Amino acid sequence: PIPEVLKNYMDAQYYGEIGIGTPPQCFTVVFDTGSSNLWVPSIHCKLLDIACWIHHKYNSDKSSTYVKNGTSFDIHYGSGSLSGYLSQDTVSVPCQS
Amino acid sequence: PIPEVLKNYMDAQYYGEIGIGTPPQCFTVVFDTGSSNLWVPSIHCKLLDIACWIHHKYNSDKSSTYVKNGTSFDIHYGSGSLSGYLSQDTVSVPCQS
Amino acid sequence: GVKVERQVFGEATKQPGITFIAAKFDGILGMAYPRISVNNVLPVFDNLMQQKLVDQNIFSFYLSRDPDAQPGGELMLGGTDSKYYKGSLSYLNVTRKAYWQVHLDQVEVASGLTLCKEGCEAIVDTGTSLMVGPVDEVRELQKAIGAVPLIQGEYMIPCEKVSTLPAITLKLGGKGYKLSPEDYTLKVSQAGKTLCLSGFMGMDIPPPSGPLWILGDVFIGRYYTVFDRDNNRVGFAEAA
Amino acid sequence: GGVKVERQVFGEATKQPGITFIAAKFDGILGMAYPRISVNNVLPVFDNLMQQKLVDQNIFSFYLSRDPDAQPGGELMLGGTDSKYYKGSLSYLNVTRKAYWQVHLDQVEVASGLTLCKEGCEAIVDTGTSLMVGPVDEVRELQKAIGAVPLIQGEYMIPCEKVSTLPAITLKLGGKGYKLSPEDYTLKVSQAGKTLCLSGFMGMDIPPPSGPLWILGDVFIGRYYTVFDRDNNRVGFAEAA
Ligand SMILES: COc1ccc(CNC(=O)[C@@H](Cc2ccccc2)NC(=N)NC(=O)Cc2ccc(OC)c(OC)c2)cc1OC
Ligand SMILES: COc1ccc(CNC(=O)[C@@H](Cc2ccccc2)NC(=N)NC(=O)Cc2ccc(OC)c(OC)c2)cc1OC
Ligand SMILES: *[C@@H]1O[C@H](CO)[C@@H](O[C@@H]2O[C@H](CO)[C@@H](O)[C@H](O)[C@H]2NC(C)=O)[C@H](O)[C@H]1NC(C)=O
Ligand SMILES: *[C@@H]1O[C@H](CO)[C@@H](O[C@@H]2O[C@H](CO)[C@@H](O)[C@H](O)[C@H]2NC(C)=O)[C@H](O)[C@H]1NC(C)=O
Ligand SMILES: *[C@@H]1O[C@H](CO)[C@@H](O)[C@H](O)[C@H]1NC(C)=O
Numbered sequence: 001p002i003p004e005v006l007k008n009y010m011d012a013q014y015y016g017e018i019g020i021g022t023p024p025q026c027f028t029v030v031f032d033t034g035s036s037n038l039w040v041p042s043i044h045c046k047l048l049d050i051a052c053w054i055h056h057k058y059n060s061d062k063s064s065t066y067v068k069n070g071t072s073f074d075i076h077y078g079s080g081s082l083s084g085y086l087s088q089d090t091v092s093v094p095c096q097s
Numbered sequence: 098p099i100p101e102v103l104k105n106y107m108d109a110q111y112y113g114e115i116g117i118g119t120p121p122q123c124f125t126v127v128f129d130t131g132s133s134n135l136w137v138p139s140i141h142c143k144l145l146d147i148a149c150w151i152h153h154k155y156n157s158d159k160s161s162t163y164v165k166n167g168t169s170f171d172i173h174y175g176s177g178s179l180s181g182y183l184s185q186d187t188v189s190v191p192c193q194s
Numbered sequence: 195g196v197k198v199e200r201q202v203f204g205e206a207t208k209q210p211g212i213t214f215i216a217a218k219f220d221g222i223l224g225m226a227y228p229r230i231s232v233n234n235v236l237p238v239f240d241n242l243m244q245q246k247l248v249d250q251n252i253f254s255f256y257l258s259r260d261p262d263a264q265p266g267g268e269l270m271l272g273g274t275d276s277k278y279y280k281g282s283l284s285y286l287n288v289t290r291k292a293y294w295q296v297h298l299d300q301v302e303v304a305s306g307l308t309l310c311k312e313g314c315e316a317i318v319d320t321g322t323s324l325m326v327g328p329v330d331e332v333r334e335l336q337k338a339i340g341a342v343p344l345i346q347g348e349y350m351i352p353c354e355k356v357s358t359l360p361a362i363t364l365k366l367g368g369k370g371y372k373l374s375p376e377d378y379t380l381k382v383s384q385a386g387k388t389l390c391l392s393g394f395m396g397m398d399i400p401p402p403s404g405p406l407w408i409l410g411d412v413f414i415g416r417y418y419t420v421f422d423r424d425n426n427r428v429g430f431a432e433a434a
Numbered sequence: 435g436g437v438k439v440e441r442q443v444f445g446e447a448t449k450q451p452g453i454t455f456i457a458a459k460f461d462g463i464l465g466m467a468y469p470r471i472s473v474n475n476v477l478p479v480f481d482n483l484m485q486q487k488l489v490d491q492n493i494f495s496f497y498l499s500r501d502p503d504a505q506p507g508g509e510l511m512l513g514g515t516d517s518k519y520y521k522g523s524l525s526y527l528n529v530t531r532k533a534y535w536q537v538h539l540d541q542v543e544v545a546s547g548l549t550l551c552k553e554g555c556e557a558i559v560d561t562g563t564s565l566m567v568g569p570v571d572e573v574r575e576l577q578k579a580i581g582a583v584p585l586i587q588g589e590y591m592i593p594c595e596k597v598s599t600l601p602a603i604t605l606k607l608g609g610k611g612y613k614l615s616p617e618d619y620t621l622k623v624s625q626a627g628k629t630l631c632l633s634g635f636m637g638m639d640i641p642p643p644s645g646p647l648w649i650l651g652d653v654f655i656g657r658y659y660t661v662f663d664r665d666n667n668r669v670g671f672a673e674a675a
Contacts, residue, residue: 001273002196007218008258008266009626012323014411016221016269020203020204021332029223031255031269032321033294033421034408036231038238039204040221046207048583050591051214054628058205066355073204075232078322078397080213084206090240091198093271098489098514099437105499105507106385108621109564111652112460113510117444124461128496128510129562130662131649132465133472135479136445137458143448145342147350148455151387155446162440170445172473174562175638177454179574181447184627188442188479212586216625345453384457 003033004093018020019092021063026095027056037075038091042084058087100130101190113126116189118160123192124153134172134186139181155184196271198242202235222321225253225421226269229292243423248272251423255320256433259377259415274429279418283429286367293317295423296366296428301327304360307338315406316366318419318428322410324348324395325378332396335362339375341392349392351379364413373429377416377427435617437512439483463562466494466662480512484664489513492664494563497674500618500656514588515670520659524670527608532560535662537607537669539648542568545601548579556647557607559660559669563651565589565636566619575635576603580616582633590633591619597631605650612671618657 006016007028015028020040027040031064043059045052067088074083103113104125112125117137118175124137142149157163166183224231225239236244243251248271256268256278268275274283277374286296298316301309309331327335329347336342339359341349351359359375378393393412399405420429447462466471466480477485484492491511497509497519511517513523527537539557542550550572568576570588577583580600582590592600600616619634634653640646661670 001250001275003270003273003275005265006257006267006269008261008263009218010261010382011259011411011415013218014257014267014288014320016267022302027220028218029221030219030321031225032222032319033225033255034317034319034321035222035224036226036228036237037204037233037235038201038221038223039206041209042205044205044206045209045317049207049209050583050585050630051217051249052206053591053593054630055214055220055342060205067200069202071233073233075204075299080209080211081209082202082206082214083208086202086233086235087205088200088202091203093196093198093200096195096197098491098516099435099512100516101510101512102506103498103510105502105504107308107623108460108500108502108652108656110459111496111498111561113508115464123620125459126462126464127460127562128465128466129560130466130496131558131560131562132463133467133469133478134445134465134474134476135442135463136447137462138450139446139448140438141448141632142450146448146450147342147453148343148450148458149447150350150352151389152455152458152461153597155539156598157446168474169537170474170499172445179447179451180449180496181445183443184446185441185443187614188439188444190437191437191440193438209528215630216628218626385459389456 002093017095019095019097020058021089022065024092024095024097025056025058025059025062026097035077039075039082039084060087063089099190102169103191106137114192116192117155118186119162121189121194122153122155123194124155132174136172136179136181157184160186196242196247198238198247199245201241212360226293229293239423242271252420254418254420256418257320257411257415274420278429278434280321280434281431283420283431284367284369285427285429288426288428289315291405291426292320294428297408299365299368302363302365303335303338304363305332305338308409310336314365316409317406318409318414318421320411320414322408323394324410325412326395326397326408326410328405329396332394335394336392339392344391347396349394351390351392353388353390364409366430371413373413373416375379378412437483437488439479439488439621440486442479442482447560465489467534468532480664483512493661495659496655497659498561498652498656499501511557516663519675520672522673523607524661525610526668529667529669532667533644534560535610535669536647540606540609543604543606544576544579545603546579548575550576551648552589553609556672557650558647559650559655559662561652561655563649564653565634565651566653567636567638567649567651569646570637570639576635580633585632588637590635592633594629594631605654607671612654612658614654614657
């Protein structure tokens with residue numbers, strides 16, 4: 001079994017570190033049993049996306065195991081929504097950078 | 098001239114201390130050149146008014162210079178609104194408690 | 195650690211609104227069933243299972259309810275961690291394999307009020323901060339505990355009343371899961387003032403998915419949770 | 435010392451809908467504009483203070499600190515000005531409508547070329563408005579010139595790394611220029627340990643008859659010490675210390 005430490009922000013957000021790509025690029029994510037997709041901000045996020053100014057961004061150009069997909073996605077939670085495109089790569093838990 | 102020191106909260110709210118009643122009951126207020134009424138929370142605020150739970154409340158029963166009025170009022174700002182009733186008393190600047 | 199090969203995931207380019215601006219985290223890693231995956235993408239845990247990267251196809255959560263505590267929580271992939279729970283795990287079968295959905299027998303307020311009187315459906319969601327229930331039933335619950343509406347289905351309770359509130363018990367698999375008032379209330383602080391938020395939010399989940407109650411972080415924090423894909427069941431034990 | 439304004443009519447608030455007043459550091463509002471906009475035509479505090487001759491000069495002035503760490507955070511001077519908080523001489527503008535503290539705004543110039551309020555417009559000097567406020571279409575054009583992006587409800591954010599290269603924005607009042615540097619018109623905001631830079635200009639249309647109006651809020655008053663003169667119905671500005 002693999003333990004993944006989580007941080008707790010105000011008893012509202014529980015999140016841990018993962019890695020995406022070769023070598024791994026580190027991201028913090030909510031391990032969410034209420035949804036089924038994995039997503040992180042892209043280095044290709046639009047300038048209009050203020051959240052991506054202050055969050056870690058995935059750069060496909062730095063990953064040797066990146067596989068282009070490009071299919072559009074749109075995810076709606078209860079809180080709000082987001083969109084982007086699909087990609088394929090190795091996911092590390094914990095980051096292992 | 099009378100100086101009234103102000104506190105600065107996040108370059109967004111500038112406020113100072115005043116007194117209402119005899120003896121003065123202290124309140125913090127924004128001295129606002131964009132409006133013309135003075136108001137503070139009442140000890141008679143409705144249970145539904147969450148803001149009242151954590152702000153100072155005027156108690157007319159503790160003031161020897163309180164003069165009943167009771168006329169209803171409604172104030173709307175760009176931001177939000179509030180309502181209550183009118184009263185008359187001595188206003189001290191600073192609180193002078 | 196684990197390395198999940200050839201995982202399909204989303205590169206987010208647009209995040210409208212303020213939702214994700216203040217959030218401490220970068221993204222979301224969904225752990226529910228493939229049924230609700232957008233674009234029918236094989237989820238991380240499903241890929242992990244197909245690649246046989248763990249011997250047991252289960253994962254477990256410990257969530258701390260004290261924000262000062264170290265660690266803030268722990269996800270165990272491929273097992274459980276007895277250091278974060280007491281006694282034995284009690285299991286319930288998943289009733290629909292999309293969200294981690296289980297049957298909720300009833301919701302009892304110690305002062306008398308009964309909600310979900312004849313049984314209802316509930317999901318176990320680490321990604322929902324609060325307990326969520328139908329608008330009208332949560333309205334009744336909030337009246338019973340003296341809470342007042344804040345905004346968007348949320349309610350506040352005068353902090354001085356919290357110590358005297360009734361406990362709320364959720365009946366799952368014939369057993370009672372009690373939440374004391376300290377368990378179901380959240381202390382929130384802004385501009386040097388403090389308020390007590392009700393841990394129950396009123397929101398109707400529309401069909402076909404709903405109606406559903408949501409057992410969010412408020413519940414998981416009190417009850418260590420095991421998500422079992424091998425037997426399609428959810429396990430609970432009292433958190434350490 | 436202090437002042438005691440006798441027989442003042444004020445409101446006892448019993449309902450405050452929404453979240454507006456919950457987080458606010460303050461308990462209430464003490465309005466200092468003209469009697470014309472007083473709800474229920476209540477005689478305002480400063481009007482009552484004047485009628486009771488509690489000060490020699492019927493003026494009041496504001497110093498507002500733009501550094502939240504500074505002591506004091508600001509100063510209101512009743513019946514006078516405080517030279518310790520301003521440099522140089524006061525320049526005066528006539529009040530054009532005695533309701534808000536309204537003055538004539540000649541134009542708004544962005545150093546990079548853009549001109550707003552091209553043929554003159556109306557503006558109010560408001561200590562109770564945190565930001566500069568201007569018409570939606572004109573503010574939208576200003577935000578495009580500085581590379582700011584919409585946040586929510588007429589507010590915009592600017593990438594913090596761009597602030598040092600932004601143009602100055604000058605307000606022309608009484609034939610004189612009042613410059614706001616990028617440091618004067620941006621606010622550093624931190625939420626959940628994250629640093630963002632908020633634009634100090636908000637787009638909001640104020641409907642006629644009162645509008646259209648630009649609002650010279652705390653952003654402006656912070657850089658320019660402000661005198662509100664009821665004896666001569668004028669507003670005075672000087673460079674803040
Ligand atoms: C019908 O309306 C509503 C219905 C329900 C809710 C609350 N529950 C959810 O929205 C669930 C999805 C769900 C929706 C419907 C039924 C069953 C599950 N969300 C998630 N599991 N995950 C996320 O949302 C990812 C996320 C995003 C941002 C976060 O912080 C900024 C964040 O912090 C922890 C997590 C709110 C509604 O409206 C207010
Ligand atoms: C047309 O719509 C909008 C128009 C204008 C604005 C911004 N400006 C104001 O709303 C002015 C009034 C005004 C309205 C219209 C024209 C000229 C002046 N406000 C005040 N001078 N005073 C207050 O608001 C008291 C107060 C209350 C709460 C506070 O924080 C919790 C607070 O902190 C400093 C101060 C927003 C709009 O909408 C977003
Ligand atoms: C991009 O990724 C998507 C993932 O959604 C691929 O399409 C899916 O493929 C799986 C099997 O590998 C199917 O079970 C899903 O039903 C498919 N989804 C959809 C929406 O068709 C897709 O083939 C990948 N490749 C490209 C170039 O888009
Ligand atoms: C309650 O206070 C109000 C407001 O000050 C009083 O009514 C105002 O009286 C002044 C003169 O003193 C007038 O100029 C205003 O036009 C009046 N306002 C209104 C809305 O009529 C009122 O007389 C006071 N007394 C009671 C018992 O209500
Ligand atoms: C739970 O599911 C298992 C396997 O499908 C079954 O054997 C068991 O009887 C079920 N338990 C209940 C309480 O229905």
